[PDB]
Amino acid sequence: ASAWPEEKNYHQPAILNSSALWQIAEGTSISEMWQNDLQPLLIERYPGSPGSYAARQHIMQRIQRLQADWVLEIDTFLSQTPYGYRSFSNIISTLNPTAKRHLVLACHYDSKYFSHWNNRVFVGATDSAVPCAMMLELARALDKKLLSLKPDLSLQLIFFDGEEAFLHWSPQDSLYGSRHLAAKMASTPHPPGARGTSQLHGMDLLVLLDLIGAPNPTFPNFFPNSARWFERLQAIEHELHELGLLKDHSLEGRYFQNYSYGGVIQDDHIPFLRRGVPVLHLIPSPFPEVWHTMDDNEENLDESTIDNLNKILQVFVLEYLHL
Ligand SMILES: [Zn+2]
């Protein structure tokens, strides 16, 4: 039996030089993302709501206008909830569907349900409207390079529905979309016609973005089997910084620090991690101060920090895909 599922263990990045880094920093526009990808998502969008629908259409429309050969799938399913049976819909955007391996970027597009309080509405700006916009901006910004993909390795984006609990977190009330998708992918032969390999074996790495957008985030290196990739994020941040390609940024206050975090954090990566998928969890610790508060809004977002992370992530993806 082919040993292709092991290729991910030996995969190395094709590192960009100074000139290329300058080009990537120049190619991303934080103001464009702000107006075209983020603001339309800053609305109430808990599962089943009109906003969930509007968000899903926004995300799909923005991917569909790109030149790259994105194949969009809406994975809709039912699940029991504290409010009875309900419908959910994950959004999966895939380049080269039959491609055996894919680097996967992900986040959740639902917003935690909260009844309006004193005319305030919860829109989860950092949680996770920004991660959503960041993935859209990356697809747009790297569009020309991704188009060239039209190593049997390509890219995939997942926007999970129902990451949030309807009440407070519990094993059964939360991670609706990811628990469902992880199970579906684990039982789907891949590539097509395969005898004993699944879509999960095809996942080179799950890079999950969550709670991004607040000032001074510090991301810990959570897992040893993705530690070398965390290292690459550190190196990229360091080099972009040294080249003067980051804004209001210092090494003392770097985002990717030299520290681990032993505990467990409940999030969409769990169902994948427990089935063996390598995970690079881009969630900060501590969480943003506005976490699950009506203040997790646009006003409290740190623009230059988001801009800096767009450059780091875009460089990471290009290097991973050898583009
Ligand atoms: Zn949340």
Side-chain angles (χ1 to χ4, degrees), residues 8-9 38 41 73 75 81 83 103 112 145 151 174 183 189 203 211 239-240 249 253 273 286 296 305 312-313:
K8 51 167 173 283
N9 303 145
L38 175 66
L41 289 170
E73 293 179 292
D75 164 50
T81 73
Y83 291 112
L103 162 71
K112 184 164 183 51
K145 285 157 181 296
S174 67
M203 292 188 55
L211 316 187
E239 193 69 18
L240 284 172
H249 179 279
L273 180 72
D296 185 2
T305 295
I312 291 160
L313 184 71

Side-chain angles (χ1 to χ4, degrees), residues 108 110-112 122 127-128 163-165 210-211 291-292 296:
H108 75 91
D110 64 308
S111 62
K112 184 164 183 51
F122 181 78
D127 184 14
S128 291
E163 181 270 359
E164 302 281 18
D210 202 2
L211 316 187
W291 180 79
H292 290 189
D296 185 2

Side-chain angles (χ1 to χ4, degrees), residues 125-128 130-131 134 208-214 219 282-284 288 301 306 309:
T126 68
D127 184 14
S128 291
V130 166
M134 290 175 71
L208 169 66
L209 284 60
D210 202 2
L211 316 187
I212 298 176
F219 301 92
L282 304 195
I283 187 175
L301 294 177
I306 302 174
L309 291 167

Side-chain angles (χ1 to χ4, degrees), residues 68-134:
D69 199 17
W70 293 102
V71 179
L72 287 163
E73 293 179 292
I74 300 309
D75 164 50
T76 301
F77 63 99
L78 275 181
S79 173
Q80 174 55 135
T81 73
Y83 291 112
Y85 295 176
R86 293 178 74 89
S87 187
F88 293 82
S89 299
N90 294 317
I91 296 161
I92 298 102
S93 196
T94 311
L95 284 180
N96 305 281
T98 66
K100 290 202 298 301
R101 305 163 51 199
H102 287 80
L103 162 71
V104 187
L105 303 192
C107 82
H108 75 91
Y109 77 96
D110 64 308
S111 62
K112 184 164 183 51
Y113 172 75
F114 281 110
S115 68
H116 304 348
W117 180 80
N118 292 164
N119 302 312
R120 299 192 70 189
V121 177
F122 181 78
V123 306
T126 68
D127 184 14
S128 291
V130 166
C132 281
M134 290 175 71

Side-chain angles (χ1 to χ4, degrees), residues 33-279:
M33 177 202 92
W34 214 277
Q35 180 199 299
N36 307 323
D37 286 314
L38 175 66
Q39 288 176 328
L41 289 170
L42 291 172
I43 55 181
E44 175 166 38
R45 56 197 187 285
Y46 59 87
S49 75
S52 169
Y53 178 69
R56 190 158 61 243
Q57 302 294 307
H58 168 66
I59 295 174
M60 292 180 81
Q61 290 174 169
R62 295 289 291 166
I63 285 162
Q64 300 184 310
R65 64 182 284 287
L66 305 176
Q67 296 186 207
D69 199 17
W70 293 102
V71 179
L72 287 163
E73 293 179 292
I74 300 309
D75 164 50
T76 301
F77 63 99
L78 275 181
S79 173
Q80 174 55 135
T81 73
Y83 291 112
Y85 295 176
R86 293 178 74 89
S87 187
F88 293 82
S89 299
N90 294 317
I91 296 161
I92 298 102
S93 196
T94 311
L95 284 180
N96 305 281
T98 66
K100 290 202 298 301
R101 305 163 51 199
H102 287 80
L103 162 71
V104 187
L105 303 192
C107 82
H108 75 91
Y109 77 96
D110 64 308
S111 62
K112 184 164 183 51
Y113 172 75
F114 281 110
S115 68
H116 304 348
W117 180 80
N118 292 164
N119 302 312
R120 299 192 70 189
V121 177
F122 181 78
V123 306
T126 68
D127 184 14
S128 291
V130 166
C132 281
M134 290 175 71
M135 285 162 67
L136 291 174
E137 165 56 11
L138 178 148
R140 181 205 74 72
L142 308 185
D143 200 29
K144 183 174 190 171
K145 285 157 181 296
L146 296 176
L147 172 67
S148 74
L149 289 164
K150 187 175 180 177
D152 185 19
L153 163 74
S154 194
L155 182 68
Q156 178 175 250
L157 306 178
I158 299 172
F159 295 87
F160 297 107
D161 186 358
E163 181 270 359
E164 302 281 18
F166 278 90
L167 303 182
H168 266 296
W169 177 92
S170 74
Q172 318 76 20
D173 183 19
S174 67
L175 315 191
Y176 294 97
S178 49
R179 282 183 297 108
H180 170 266
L181 192 53
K184 183 179 176 179
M185 280 175 81
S187 61
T188 302
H190 186 79
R195 298 190 274 69
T197 52
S198 75
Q199 292 190 327
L200 284 196
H201 299 156
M203 292 188 55
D204 252 47
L205 178 72
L206 172 63
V207 184
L208 169 66
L209 284 60
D210 202 2
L211 316 187
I212 298 176
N216 317 303
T218 57
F219 301 92
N221 183 172
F222 299 100
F223 312 108
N225 69 13
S226 71
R228 67 195 185 85
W229 293 116
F230 179 91
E231 262 153 49
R232 285 304 307 155
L233 288 171
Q234 293 191 103
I236 296 180
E237 171 180 36
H238 182 93
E239 193 69 18
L240 284 172
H241 176 272
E242 290 292 292
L243 293 177
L245 295 179
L246 300 182
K247 180 76 179 173
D248 299 329
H249 179 279
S250 76
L251 294 185
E252 281 300 294
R254 62 191 179 302
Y255 314 131
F256 295 100
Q257 314 229 306
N258 312 50
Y259 77 114
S260 69
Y261 175 107
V264 176
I265 295 181
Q266 289 297 303
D267 205 346
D268 291 315
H269 68 297
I270 292 303
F272 290 87
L273 180 72
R274 301 212 183 308
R275 286 186 172 75
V277 181
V279 180

